[PDB]
Amino acid sequence: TKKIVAIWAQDEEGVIGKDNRLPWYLPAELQHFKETTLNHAILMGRVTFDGMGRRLLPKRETLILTRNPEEKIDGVATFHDVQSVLDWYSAQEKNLYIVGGKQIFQAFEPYLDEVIVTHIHARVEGDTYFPAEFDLSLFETVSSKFYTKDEKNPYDFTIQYRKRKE
Amino acid sequence: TKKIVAIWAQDEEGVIGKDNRLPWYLPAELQHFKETTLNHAILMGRVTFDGMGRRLLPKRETLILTRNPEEKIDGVATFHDVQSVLDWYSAQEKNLYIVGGKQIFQAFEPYLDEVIVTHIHARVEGDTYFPAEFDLSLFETVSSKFYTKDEKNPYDFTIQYRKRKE
Numbered sequence: 126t127k128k129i130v131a132i133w134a135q136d137e138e139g140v141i142g143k144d145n146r147l148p149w150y151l152p153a154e155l156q157h158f159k160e161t162t163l164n165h166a167i168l169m170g171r172v173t174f175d176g177m178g179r180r181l182l183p184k185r186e187t188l189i190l191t192r193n194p195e196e197k198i199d200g201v202a203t204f205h206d207v208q209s210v211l212d213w214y215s216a217q218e219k220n221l222y223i224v225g226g227k228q229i230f231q232a233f234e235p236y237l238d239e240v241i242v243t244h245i246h247a248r249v250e251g252d253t254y255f256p257a258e259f260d261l262s263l264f265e266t267v268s269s270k271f272y273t274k275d276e277k278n279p280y281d282f283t284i285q286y287r288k289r290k291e
Numbered sequence: 292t293k294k295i296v297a298i299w300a301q302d303e304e305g306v307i308g309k310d311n312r313l314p315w316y317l318p319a320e321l322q323h324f325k326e327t328t329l330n331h332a333i334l335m336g337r338v339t340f341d342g343m344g345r346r347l348l349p350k351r352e353t354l355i356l357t358r359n360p361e362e363k364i365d366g367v368a369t370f371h372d373v374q375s376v377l378d379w380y381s382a383q384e385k386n387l388y389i390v391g392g393k394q395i396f397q398a399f400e401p402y403l404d405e406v407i408v409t410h411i412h413a414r415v416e417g418d419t420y421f422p423a424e425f426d427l428s429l430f431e432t433v434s435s436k437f438y439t440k441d442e443k444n445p446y447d448f449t450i451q452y453r454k455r456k457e
């Protein structure tokens with residue numbers, strides 16, 4: 126039942142970030158993020174955390190990965206290496222969602238059970254892309270859904286759930 | 292020539308914020324913001340400062356308004372009340388841009404020489420509205436320009452420059 130899942134959103138070319146934030150705004154996609162991670166743990170890099178104004182998502186067990194030994198935010202648990210997070214994960218039952226920052230996605234690739242990827246049907250300008258060396262072939266699409274754009278969500282997008290091929 | 296200017300962006304209903312961020316993403320509008328405030332000073336409330344990850348913008352003198360006893364913060368100047376900012380402003384020659392936070396906009400409205408308002412032609416969900424306690428009759432629109440929507444900027448928007456008359 127328990128698993129480590131990577132979840133991210135990207136444009137048509139793999140863009141995931143710009144100026145420490147996301148180069149788009151789609152409340153409906155954020156809603157999907159909320160429903161998926163609700164009542165679970167999420168691990169994000171220190172940069173992405175600061176990028177979102179250090180906001181603590183309600184009903185989410187927030188885990189921050191940093192190399193700063195003096196880093197200490199109230200409301201969140203700090204981790205300084207991958208092994209530490211894996212030990213934490215094994216000592217509990219909740220699913221663990223790798224939520225972001227290209228470096229974090231790269232660091233956890235070997236331990237991923239599944240990926241939930243949102244393909245935004247648009248092309249934007251970004252300075253950070255999903256890891257091009259990430260081997261998505263080891264995964265298989267189990268389900269997906271198309272979300273039609275509207276006033277508040279200017280770009281169409283699709284969400285795919287892909288499990289690790291046996 | 293020097294003056295105190297308020298700059299902000301709002302949707303058709305006056306929405307300026309949602310969950311401590313701006314409910315939209317328009318690189319061309321952010322480029323506009325940079326062109327306007329570049330090489331000058333900008334004053335933002337502590338909330339907004341936190342909201343953008345304490346990210347210090349380049350070629351900008353950042354001023355933070357807060358009641359927090361702290362005498363200083365980052366590579367920024369800390370102020371503890373409205374009058375303090377106005378006095379600092381009087382002792383120098385650069386234009387002062389009031390850039391954000393509903394409370395900060397409201398606090399400096401009586402001292403504004405000009406407003407530069409971006410009118411985003413769309414309706415989005417906000418939890419923070421521009422504090423419109425301005426006697427509009429006091430200002431005159433010198434000009435406004437239109438920016439047609441495109442792939443990276445999904446909403447049309449108009450930037451209006453208004454100066455205090457009489």
Ligand SMILES: NC(=O)C1=CN([C@@H]2O[C@H](COP(=O)(O)OP(=O)(O)OC[C@H]3O[C@@H](n4cnc5c(N)ncnc54)[C@H](OP(=O)(O)O)[C@@H]3O)[C@@H](O)[C@H]2O)C=CC1
Binds near residue numbers: 172207
């Ligand atoms: N589109 C999407 O789905 C998402 C996009 N993003 C975007 O991606 C960009 C951020 O990505 P990125 O720049 O890679 O930053 P990350 O979010 O990956 O964070 C990087 C930081 O994590 C810490 N870190 C990294 N590796 C380790 C390690 N092995 N051990 C301990 N600490 C480590 C360090 O923090 P420290 O420097 O403190 O030591 C490092 O600076 C932003 O634009 C963000 O908005 C983020 C999430 C999702």
Ligand SMILES: NC(=O)C1=CN([C@@H]2O[C@H](COP(=O)(O)OP(=O)(O)OC[C@H]3O[C@@H](n4cnc5c(N)ncnc54)[C@H](OP(=O)(O)O)[C@@H]3O)[C@@H](O)[C@H]2O)C=CC1
Binds near residue numbers: 309310340371391398
């Ligand atoms: N659309 C746009 O153009 C912009 C929108 N925004 C949005 O506005 C929202 C934030 O607005 P708001 O919540 O009002 O926060 P503000 O950014 O206005 O910051 C408020 C804080 O400033 C300090 N402060 C306020 N008044 C005084 C005073 N008289 N003397 C000393 N310090 C004072 C306090 O900080 P402390 O609590 O530390 O004492 C107060 O909590 C966010 O959603 C943000 O995204 C922000 C900028 C632009």
Ligand SMILES: CN(Cc1cnc2nc(N)nc(N)c2n1)c1ccc(C(=O)N[C@@H](CCC(=O)O)C(=O)O)cc1
Binds near residue numbers: 152176183223242
């Ligand atoms: C920057 N950032 C990270 C971010 C954004 N979108 C993503 N989208 C996906 N698919 N995957 C991610 N890792 C992801 N990460 C953010 C920023 C804000 C919120 C946020 O406010 N989320 C609300 C939901 C907002 C809503 O319901 O519209 C929540 O409670 O989770 C989440 C992630």
Ligand SMILES: CN(Cc1cnc2nc(N)nc(N)c2n1)c1ccc(C(=O)N[C@@H](CCC(=O)O)C(=O)O)cc1
Binds near residue numbers: 298299325348389
């Ligand atoms: C949240 N926030 C405040 C914000 C955003 N847009 C605004 N837009 C207007 N017109 N007025 C404001 N006061 C305003 N404030 C931000 C967030 C990021 C950047 C920013 O990255 N600015 C870069 C430009 C980034 C870009 O060109 O993409 C700069 O150097 O000014 C500015 C303000």
